[PDB]
A paper describes a structure:
[name] glutamate receptors (AMPARs), the primary mediators of excitatory neurotransmission in the brain, are either [name] subunit-containing and thus Ca2+-impermeable, or [name]-lacking and Ca2+-permeable. [name] glutamate receptors (AMPARs) mediate rapid signalling throughout the brain, and orchestrate various forms of synaptic plasticity that underlie learning. These cation channels assemble in various combinations from four core subunits, [name]–4, with each contributing unique gating kinetics, trafficking and subsynaptic localization. AMPARs exhibit a modular architecture with a two-layer extracellular region connected to the transmembrane ion channel (transmembrane domain, TMD). The ion channel is encircled by diverse auxiliary subunits, modulating receptor gating kinetics, pharmacology and ion flux, with the transmembrane AMPAR regulatory proteins (TARPs γ2, γ3, γ4, γ5, γ7, γ8) being the most abundant.
The Phe231 to alanine mutation, which destabilizes this interface, slowed desensitization recovery of [name]([name]), both in the absence and presence of TARPs (γ2 and γ3). NTD and LBD changes contributed additively: the R/G-unedited (Arg743) isoform harbouring a mutated B/D NTD interface (Phe231Ala) recovered the slowest. A desensitized [name]([name]) structure unedited at the R/G site (Arg743) exhibited more separation of the LBD dimers and an approximately 10% increase of non-swapped receptors relative to the edited Gly743 isoform, approaching [name]. This suggests that the re-assembly of desensitized A/D LBDs is attenuated by Arg743 through charge repulsion, resulting in a greater proportion of A/B LBD dimers, and thus non-swapped receptors. Closer analysis of the three sets of desensitized structures reveals a gradual transition of the LBD tier into four-fold symmetry, which is greatest for [name] and smallest for the edited [name] mutant: [name] > [name]([name])-Arg743 > [name]([name])-Gly743. Hence, communication between the NTD tier and electrostatics at the R/G site in the LBD orchestrates AMPAR desensitization recovery.
Author numbering:
A (entry chain H): 5 to 43, 55 to 84, 93 to 162, 173 to 210
B (entry chain D): 765 to 773, 784 to 813
C (entry chain B): 569 to 626, 633 to 666
D (entry chain C): 422 to 551, 569 to 625, 633 to 764
The structure:
């Protein structure tokens, strides 16, 4: 029903936004082997910004990843400055604002389309971000739970996107009816 | 003795090998949305 | 739905031979079946081609001798070979 | 009990001595300690007069014969390679997903969802376009393109055709890379073989004629093996043949042991029957009954070995 569509869209927005924000914040992206803190080879949480240490003499010491240790420069820049993961959060926020503003200033019907575009674009940004992360890291390992949170954010964002466009289509159908 | 007797000197395609095709794909998805919105 | 039994067999055959579609299943259930057949076809056909590309790139034991006679066998009419055989305590 | 226990009894009968079997304290064959210059193992026991004779698989070497006395060889042999019989790990149930990495497969799913959604958006959002590409039909179109299984419908707009075009390009490149890698994914017999590699670990007894053979070998292949082995990790040097052998067995063939051919042949006939002797003998050497340098027992042991040789006592003990 129409009242259910908005509820699913709104709750999914919050969900995707929260998951992506937790993922960008937490440090459990890749459990791999390395240094917990140093100017020797133990398991480490290693997130997007900071690498910490699971098991070790300074188990708990977290240092900043030295992203910078032409094409590599550029990829290393795009990675260090997580422009793509961060842009996903920004777009998802904007999308939520639009969904919310579907109420006040109603009957505009273009706020809803904008919300769909923002959520779909957030999904695309996340996938570029994932590709950049995986490609960088590579020059054993297992992906943490924040990586998989990021992934679930993409899926939910795309679904909320499909719902948003569907609602816009219905609005204009009824307006044409 | 001192030169050579004591001498000290398939895999799956990784995402790194195909990342370019992903970049083109997402870029193309971007342009399609631009074309549509402009129309 | 044109997917009677004969058109189903034709659809499946065509898919394995990577050829035309004509009809394409249109329900969720039919599309699940179609999807897994498509996946199966891709893996199996790719594996045939790859392995062919490898196939285009790159009497035995004494028991066997004893067990057959089409390929007769003997020794120098007088020799150490004939004598070992005449005295071997190994059944074969 | 065993070859050397049976050999000792016959040796004593023919040498003409009464005897007491004692196991060498350090469990080694005998080498001049690289460092302290002290002879260890059975050779050391003879050199320092702790034992009057060594009825053991002790290889006749010059440095050994210079510090102990040896009978004629009671056994001819050579270093050999013991490998765990291959038995290549069977293909995994889902090994067909191998030509491409895990992350590629993950991102192929993500890209499928992305392409399908964007085709729906660009195709139906505009009110000025009112089967066609709804969400279910768009997912079906995308799957069909990837599985190369033809198209029932195709985008007609400029927007839809851009999406379709890039998805087709992506599919071609990704699918072709799978076929190819699969192709490639579907495309040691001596001491020389071991020497020209290192992957398969391989080493000698930590202390004895074998380690010394390589430290002294003038053969390029064996010196090459030695260069690697002294540095091989984990230390490919072992305290007993069985240790190298167990090293061989436990490695699923990742450890080859340079035990003497005699030991190799013996272990090949022992359960779990998982090992096999490969490579030729790495030297043309022999085992001798040893006595302290200049010992009176040397002459009896030389004579008894010849008696047990002409009788085939040692050869019977082998079989
Ligand atoms: C019809 C519609 C079709 C779609 C149209 C056009 C689509 C084209 C999309 C952009 C192309 C990617 C850019 C790129 O490869 O730059 C860099 C990586 O790039 C990165 O590391 C940045 C990661 C995100 C960029 C992708 C945004 C989308 C690589 O540097 P480069 O300068 O590209 O040099 C080539 C690399 N080489 C020299 C080492 C071989
Ligand atoms: C090769 C050869 C191709 C053979 C042609 C397929 C049969 C066609 C029959 C058919 O279309 O008639 C009807 C089925 O008619 C029946 O009642 C089916 C009888 C059972 C046969 C099932 C064989 C396939 C199963 C496994 C074989 C092993 C349906 O069509 P319609 O809607 O009546 O028109
Ligand atoms: C009319 C309907 C429109 C449909 C259109 C769909 C597009 C299909 C093709 C896509 C790939 C084209 C992009 C190829 C990118 C070339 C990259 C390049 O120039 O390589 C860089 C450099 O040469 C190396 O170092
Ligand atoms: C809209 C219509 C929908 C159609 C739907 C049908 C399409 C199905 C296609 C392919 C399925 C392939 C399944 C892949 C399963 C492989 C997972 C796996 O085994 O991975 C575990 C791995 O072995 C750990 O080491
Ligand atoms: C458009 C859909 C294409 C078909 C997608 C195939 C699904 C693949 C799923 C991932 C399997 C991962 C295998 C590697 C697992 C591992 O080694 O840990």
């Amino acid at each position: 029903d129409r009242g259910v569509q908005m509820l699913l869209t709104t709750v999914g927005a919050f969900a995707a936004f929260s998951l992506m924000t937790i993922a960008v914040g937490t440090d459990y992206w890749l459990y791999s082997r390395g240094v917990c803190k140093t100017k020797e080879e133990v398991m480490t949480h290693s997130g997007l910004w900071r690498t910490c240490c699971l098991e070790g003499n300074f188990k708990g010491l977290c240092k900043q990843i030295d992203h910078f240790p032409t094409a590599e420069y550029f990829l290393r820049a795009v990675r260090a400055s997580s422009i793509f993961p961060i842009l996903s959060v920004i777009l998802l926020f904007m999308g939520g604002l639009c969904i919310a503003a579907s109420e006040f200033y109603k009957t505009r019907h273009n706020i809803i389309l904008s919300a769909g575009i923002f959520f779909v674009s957030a999904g695309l940004s996340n996938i570029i971000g994932i590709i950049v992360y995986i490609s960088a890291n590579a020059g054993s390992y297992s992906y943490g739970w924040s990586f998989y949170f990021g992934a679930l954010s993409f899926i939910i964002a795309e679904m909320v996107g499909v719902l948003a466009v569907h609602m816009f289509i219905d609005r204009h159908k009824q307006l044409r009816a | 003795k001192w030169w050579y007797d004591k001498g000290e000197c398939t895999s799956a395609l990784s995402l790194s090998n195909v990342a370019g095709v992903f970049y083109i794909l997402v870029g193309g998805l971007g342009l399609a949305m631009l074309v549509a919105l402009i129309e | 739905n044109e997917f009677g039994i004969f058109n189903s067999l034709w659809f499946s055959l065509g898919a394995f031979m990577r050829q035309g579609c004509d009809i394409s299943p249109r329900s969720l259930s039919g599309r699940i079946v179609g999807g897994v057949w498509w996946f199966f076809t891709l893996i199996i056909i790719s594996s045939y081609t790859a392995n062919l590309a490898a196939f285009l790139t790159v009497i035995e034991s004494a028991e066997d001798l004893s067990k057959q006679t089409e390929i007769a066998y003997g020794t120098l009419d007088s020799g150490s070979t004939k004598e070992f055989f005449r005295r071997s305590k190994i059944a074969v | 009990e065993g070859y050397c226990v049976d050999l000792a009894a016959e040796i004593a009968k023919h040498c003409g001595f009464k005897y007491k079997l004692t196991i060498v304290g350090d469990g080694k064959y005998g080498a001049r300690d690289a460092d302290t210059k002290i002879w260890n193992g059975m050779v050391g026991e003879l050199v320092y007069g702790k034992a009057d004779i060594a009825i053991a698989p002790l290889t006749i070497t010059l440095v050994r014969e210079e510090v102990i006395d040896f009978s004629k060889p009671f056994m001819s042999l050579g270093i050999s390679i013991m490998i765990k019989k291959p038995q290549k790990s069977k293909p995994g149930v889902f090994s067909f997903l191998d030509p491409l990495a895990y992350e590629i497969w993950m991102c192929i799913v993500f890209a499928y969802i992305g392409v399908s959604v964007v085709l729906f958006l660009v195709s139906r959002f505009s009110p000025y376009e009112w089967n066609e590409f709804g969400i279910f039909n768009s997912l079906w179109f995308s799957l069909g393109a990837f599985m190369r299984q033809g198209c029932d419908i195709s985008p007609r707009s400029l927007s839809g055709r851009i999406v379709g075009g890039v998805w087709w390009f992506f599919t071609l490149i990704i699918i072709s890379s799978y076929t190819a890698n699969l192709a490639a994914f579907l495309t040691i017999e001596s001491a020389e073989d071991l020497s020209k590699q290192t992957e398969i670990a391989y080493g000698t007894l930590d202390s004895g004629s074998t380690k010394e053979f390589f430290r002294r070998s003038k053969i390029a292949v064996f010196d090459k093996m030695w260069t690697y082995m002294r540095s091989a990790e984990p230390s490919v040097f072992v305290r007993t043949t069985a240790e190298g052998v167990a090293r061989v067995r436990k490695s699923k063939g990742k450890y080859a042991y340079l035990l003497e051919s005699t030991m190799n042949e013996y272990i090949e006939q022992r359960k779990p029957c998982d090992t096999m002797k490969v490579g030729g003998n790495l030297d043309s050497k022999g085992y001798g009954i040893a006595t302290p340098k200049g010992s009176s027992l040397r002459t009896p042991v030389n004579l008894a070995v010849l008696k047990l040789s002409e009788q085939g006592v040692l050869d019977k003990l082998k079989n």
